[PDB]
Structure formats: structure tokens, C-alpha cells
Structure 1
């Protein structure tokens, strides 16, 4: 699949807003993910002890992790589809070291859309959400293909 320049513009326009507060968006997204799909929390040995949203918000390590994740995702989105090089190491660590099923990538994609919808309604209307979903589907599709080449079905 391929996004048009118009769709990329919608994606990058709302992403520019997210970059005004990467740490904050990172926390909201992971808290949403962990609360909505608690099973994903078990994949993080560093955070699986967190019991409440309050503890999650107060975790300095979780906040730093969120920044690392969103920074990596932002770099991929800014490539506008030409992300082969960026995807290689990400696909290897998540398939081989962390063992993250494609299903879980769908869950975090849902969390990202939910947070952008809540925080940026004016810049995240129907068309913008469709563009973001398409960009994330492309990401998940290419990651899945790499998973297979690497020997991980998940």
C-alpha cells in the first residue's frame, strides 16, 4: 500500500503537535495501552510490577521509555514510507528479543489513535484519522513482512 502526499501531510501535521510534548504523549499512550490491554504489560519486565495508573504516571523509567518509543516512531513516519533501514533493527529486537505479536502492535496503534483523538480533535478529524490509520497499517504490514523473514510468525 502507498499513501498520497496529502495523507502524509495530515499525518505529519498532527505529529508536529505531538512533538510539542513527546514525554506527555508517551505517558498517555502507554497508560492507555496497559489499561485497555493489560496482557501487554506482561511483556515489559521493567514495568510489569506497576499496579495502578497512579504508579504508571509517577514512573520516571516509563516516561523515558515513552519518549524513546515515540521518537523512533516519529523518525519512521517522517520517512513517508521509505523506512526500510529504520525498520530493520526494530523488527529484529521485537521479534527476537521481546517477542511482540503483530496483535500487540495493533493494540498500541489503537492507543495512539485514541490519544490523538482526545488531545487533538481539531487536527484529528475523520480524514486525518484515516490517514494516520493508513500510516500505521503500512508500518504494521512492513514489520510483519520482516517478522517472517526473521523467522518469527507472531
Structure 2
């Protein structure tokens, strides 16, 4: 699939707001993912012991990881589709080391959309959400294809 420049503009415009508070957005997103789909927490041996949302909010470690996730995703989005180099090491670690099924990438995509909708209503109308969903679908499709080449296609 291919996004138009207009679609990328909508995506990068709301992402510029996200970048005003990367740690806060990273936290909200990972917590939303863990509350909505608790099974995903089992993949993080580093966080698997967090029992409540209160514990999650208090975790400095979870917060640092959220920053790592959003910084990596932001670097990919800013490439506007030319992200093959950035995708390679990410696909390799998630397919071979962490073993993250595509289904879980759909779950985090949903969490990202939920949080942007909640925090940025004025910059995340229907068209902007459609563009963000298209950018994340492209990301998932490309990661899925890499998974297959790497022998996982999980």
C-alpha cells in the first residue's frame, strides 16, 4: 500500500504533538495495551510482575521502555514509507528473540489510536485517524513480510 503525502501530513502533524511528551504518551500506550490485552504482558519478563495500573504507572522501567518504543516508531513514521533499514533489526528481534505475534502488533496499534484519540481530539479527527491507521497497517504489513523471510511469520 502507499500513503499519499496528505495522509503522511496528518500523521506527522499529530505525531509532533506526541513528541511534546514522549514519556507520558509511552506510558499511556503501554498501560492501555496491558489493561486491554493482559496476555501481552506475559511477553515482558521485565514487567510480568506488575499487578495493577498503579504499579505500572509507578514503574520507571516501563516508562523508559515506552520512550524506547515511541522513539523507534517515530523514526519509522518520519521515513514516510521508506523504512526498510529501520524495520530490519526490529523484525529480527521481535521475531527471533521476543517472539511477538502480528496479532500483538495489532493490539498495540489499537492502543496507540485510543490514546491519540483521547489526548488530541482536535488533531485526531476521522481523517487523521484513518491516516494513522493506514500508516500502522503499512508498518504491520511490512513487518509481517519480514517475519516470513526470517522464518517466523508469527
TM-score by length of 1: 1.00
1:67 is displaced (CA, Å) by 0.2
User: Displacement of 1:131 after TM fit?
Assistant: 0.1
Q: How does the TM-score come out when normalised to structure 2?
A: 1.00
Task: Describe the superposition over 1:56-105 as per-residue Cα deviations: whole angstroms up to 9, x where unpaired.
Answer: 00000000000000000000000000000000000000000000000000
Secondary structure of the residue aligned to 2:129 is helix
Distance 2:69 2:37 in 1: 18
Runs of 4+ aligned residues of structure 1 deviating over 2 Å after TM superposition are none
Query: How many residue pairs align between the two structures?
Result: 154
Output the aligned Cα RMSD.
Answer: 0.2
Structure 1: runs of 5 or more not aligned: none
For residue 8 of structure 1, report the CA deviation from its aligned partner: 0.0
Q: Distance in 2 between matches of 1:102 and 1:64?
A: 23
Q: Deviations over 1:106-140 (max 9, x none)?
A: 00000000000000000000000000000000000
Q: 1: distance between equivalents of 2:65 and 2:104?
A: 17
Structure 1 SS opposite 2:9: helix
Partners of 1:153 and 1:133 lie apart in 2 by 21
- How far did residue 153 of structure 1 move? 2.2
Q: Tell me how far apart the structure 2 counterparts of residues 129 and 18 of structure 1 sit (CA, whole Å).
A: 14
Alignment gaps of 5+ in structure 2: none
**Per-residue Cα deviation, 1:38-65 (whole angstroms, up to 9, x for no partner):** 0000000000000000000000000000
